[PDB]
Write a protein that binds this ligand. Structure first.
Ligand code: A1AJW
Length: 165
């Protein structure tokens, strides 16, 4: 958990312009959050990037979790291995608002972070799930009570988030 170069936005939310994968390799945090879907199929966005950095070990473990437990619910989570990136990976499902899933579930999704004292995380529902990323940061700030270190790779978005905050 040796985080460097973050800006403190609130008492417990920090932000940095970085690829979450590079932050995980540098810090090896206790928990890295994945922006997952309900079947834990890590095909693109943050999920695809984290799985590729484990050389598909995350996907083989996720497929076994689904075989034994069934899919997660939107707003839900599960804790699996963090492989080479972290001690644990917290897979969290935000709503895919472009497919009509309710934006109210973005609060439920960020509530999962409160089970861990310190997390390295992306913005939920803010990639291909279609939610406005500045709205996602507002829900994060209003819901997470533990220490969250957010990594946002796109500099244009990072600058807009810092300016809005
Ligand atoms: C979620 C989305 C707004 C954001 C935009 O840069 N994506 C990411 N954020 C952080 N590390 C990442 N690695 C691969 C993608 C990615």
């Amino acid at each position: 958990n040796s985080f460097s170069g973050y800006l403190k936005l609130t008492d417990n939310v920090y932000i940095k312009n970085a690829d979450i994968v590079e932050e995980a390799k540098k810090v090896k945090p206790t928990v890295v959050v994945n922006a997952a879907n309900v079947y834990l199929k890590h095909g693109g966005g943050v999920a695809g990037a984290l799985n590729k950095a484990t050389n598909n070990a995350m996907q083989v473990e996720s497929d076994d979790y689904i075989a034994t437990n069934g899919p997660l619910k939107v707003g839900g989570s599960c804790v699996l291995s963090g492989h080479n990136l972290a001690k644990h990976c917290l897979h969290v499902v935000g709503p895919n608002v472009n497919k009509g899933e309710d934006i109210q579930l973005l609060k439920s999704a960020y509530e999962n972070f409160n089970q861990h004292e310190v997390l390295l995380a992306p913005l939920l529902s803010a990639g291909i799930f279609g939610a406005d990323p500045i709205h996602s940061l507002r829900v994060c700030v209003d819901t997470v009570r533990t220490n969250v270190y957010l990594a946002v790779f796109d500099k244009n978005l990072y600058d807009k988030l810092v300016s809005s905050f």
